[PDB]
């Protein structure tokens, strides 16, 4: 929208940009005695009146052109007042600032959904240069050609007459609030024009037809202090008079949204499995290698020289991805916990096409609920009409704040909440000694109903199983008989334990509260949940610990499951717990493999899933098609 005023005392020269509506005001300086006007336009100019017309402010005149002029003042417009004459010389230019607003792959607001518009920006968090240890966005230069594949392309197209920019100028700018989270390189090679230091640049454009290319990169993920929207503006200013300051004549803008960080659940196909090689960790590693080979995925083993005697691969990092209509790449989120494996996600994970991100106090005080074994994500779900095609994030907390309670760090909580594509859900997991939601819940695939099954630990189921075993004449079977150097317990003495029964009742109450939370928050039914037998015992600080290896704390690779070996009672040559788990899971098409981790992980209060990390294939669904 531009207003042009014509006076009969002197003609005026105005500049119009193709595609913009130009309103022509004629009553501002019309003769007082005049009452009607007529318009004589060159054939290259289209006039719309909204053959004389009354001279009143109600009527409006709008001007349009179809071709950019080749000379200044090419097209004239004559206003005849009733007869005085007024002239308007006018030249047309085309100024376009094009991005991938259609989210299709090929080149002033951002809207969600499949019928929206707006471009997507990728954080340059990977390391495409092999002669550096920092991320690609920590410097204001592009050192590789491949580094241009993580940057969004923006094209400035100018069709202007010859010798047009001797009196006009073009400025590319961004707001000072968003200037520290974006960088723009002009392709000539790549020289920085906009960034955390320069919020404006004076573009140099030649007359005629010209196309310029800019590569845009982001330097920060969306957070509580960053909604995620960046607006880049182009301004055409008049510089006809040297003494007079430049006056803005045209302005166009392009809006980008920074792609959020997205998790992947256990139902996605696996691609790579990580593990640690600590002392005496040989049979576990052999089982993991066999399972990975069966599941057709590679393995990455960290040598003990880099473990620093740390075997908890799951807690240190969490792998997700970031995608955009032109490029998708995984990202590793580094936990604020720094124990032994503090250098692995920064030295042996982040690299070419593998980004890195971290939050929280690196050297400050944190709790045990900040470990990323407490962070999980559910399969896509429909909750009372609302759709979550990427799932929902689940992490543990307490019932109410108090002096002894623990919580995940607020920085991590606001980070996960700022990633809006998956709304986080708080679960009650502080009752556990470690406080990890992976110790009592899991997700497995299934080819029926919603497409998945939620497995929850259930002391009741184990007690019922032992009751049936004792009823069938097997009451002297020895739990922990497969393992040695430990006390084996008969079924009757484990059934007649009042303290154990009370501890398991309290644990069952907590797990039932968690299940009631999960059903409401994920829209599940009683047919979507499977109860895995388990036994807990209260310990120091009256917090629960697994009585025997946690069978729900297992590794899931497609249809292959690596389950911790419970070493339960042996009936008819087979372990009753293993037989029950096989009967519960195999009808879903899954194959159950039991891995021994007693003296290596269970003694250290960990299981197969606690010591492994898996990279999963990104969702086929495009996050920008989600409507949060």
């Amino acid at each position: 929208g531009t207003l042009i005023r014509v006076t009969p005392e002197q003609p005026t020269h105005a500049v119009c940009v193709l595609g913009t509506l130009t309103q022509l005001d004629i009553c501002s300086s019309a003769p007082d005695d005049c009452t009607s006007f007529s318009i004589n336009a060159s054939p290259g100019v289209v006039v719309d009146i909204a053959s004389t017309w009354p001279l009143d402010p109600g009527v409006e005149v709008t001007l349009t052109m179809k071709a950019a002029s080749g000379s200044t003042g090419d097209q004239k417009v004559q206003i005849s007042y009733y007869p005085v004459k007024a002239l308007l010389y006018l030249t047309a230019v085309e100024i376009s600032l094009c991005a991938d607003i259609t989210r299709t792959g090929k080149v002033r607001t951002w809207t969600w959904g499949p019928c929206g518009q707006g471009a997507i920006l990728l954080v340059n968090c990977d390391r495409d240069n092999l002669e550096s240890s920092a991320m690609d966005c920590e410097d204001d230069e592009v050192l590789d050609s491949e580094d241009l594949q993580d940057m969004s392309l923006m094209t400035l197209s100018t069709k202007t007459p010859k010798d047009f920019f001797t009196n006009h100028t073009l400025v590319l700018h961004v707001a000072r609030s968003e200037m520290d989270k974006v960088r723009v390189f002009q392709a000539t090679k790549c020289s920085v024009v906009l960034g955390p230091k320069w919020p404006s640049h004076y573009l140099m454009v030649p007359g005629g037809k010209h196309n310029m290319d800019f590569y845009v990169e982001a330097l920060a993920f969306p957070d509580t202090d960053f909604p995620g929207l960046i607006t880049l503006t182009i301004s055409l200013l008049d510089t006809s008079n040297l003494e007079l300051p430049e006056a803005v004549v045209f302005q166009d803008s392009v809006v980008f949204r920074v792609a959020p960080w997205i998790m992947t659940p256990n139902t996605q196909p696996p691609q790579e499995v990580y593990a640690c090689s600590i002392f005496e960790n040989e049979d576990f590693l052999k089982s993991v290698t066999t399972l990975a080979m069966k599941a057709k995925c590679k393995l990455t083993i960290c040598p003990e020289e880099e473990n620093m005697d740390d075997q908890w691969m799951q807690d240190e990092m969490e792998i997700g991805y970031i995608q955009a209509p032109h490029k998708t790449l995984p990202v590793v989120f580094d936990s604020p916990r720094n124990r032994g494996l503090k250098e692995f996600p920064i030295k042996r994970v982040m690299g070419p096409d593998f980004g890195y991100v971290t939050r929280g106090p690196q050297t400050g005080g944190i709790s045990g609920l900040d470990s990323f074994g407490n962070l999980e994500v559910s399969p896509p779900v429909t909750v009372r009409g609302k759709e979550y095609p990427l799932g929902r994030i689940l992490f543990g907390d307490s019932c109410y704040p108090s002096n002894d309670s623990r919580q995940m760090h607020q920085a991590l909580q606001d980070f996960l909440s700022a990633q809006q594509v998956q709304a986080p859900v708080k679960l009650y997991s502080d009752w556990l000694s470690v406080g990890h939601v992976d110790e009592f819940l899991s997700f497995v695939p299934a080819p029926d109903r919603k497409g998945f099954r939620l497995l929850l630990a259930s002391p009741r189921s184990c007690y019922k199983l032992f009751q049936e075993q004792q009823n069938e004449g097997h009451g002297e079977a020895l739990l922990f008989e497969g393992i040695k150097k430990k006390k084996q317990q008969k079924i009757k003495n484990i059934l007649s334990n009042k303290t154990l029964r009370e501890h398991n009742s309290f644990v069952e109450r907590c797990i039932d509260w968690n299940r009631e939370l999960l059903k409401r928050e994920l829209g599940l039914a009683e047919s979507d949940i499977i109860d895995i037998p388990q036994l807990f015992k209260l310990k120091e600080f009256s917090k629960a610990e697994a009585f025997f290896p946690n069978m729900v704390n297992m590794l899931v690779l497609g249809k292959h499951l690596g389950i911790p070996k419970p070493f339960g009672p042996v009936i008819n040559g087979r372990c009753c717990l293993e037989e029950k788990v096989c009967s519960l899971l195999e009808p879903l098409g899954l194959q159950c493999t039991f891995i021994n981790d007693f003296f290596t992980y269970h003694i250290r209060h960990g299981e197969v899933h606690c010591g492994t990390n898996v990279r999963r294939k990104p969702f086929s669904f495009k996050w920008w098609n989600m409507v949060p």
């Binding site: 740390d310 124990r339 900040d370 120091e540 250290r604 209060h605 606690c610």
Partner: peptide, 13 residues
């Protein structure tokens, strides 16, 4: 904690 799963613990760590 040092070699235990617990981030901090009066007994195991």
């Amino acid at each position: 904690x040092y070699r235990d799963h617990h981030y901090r613990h009066p007994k195991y760590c």
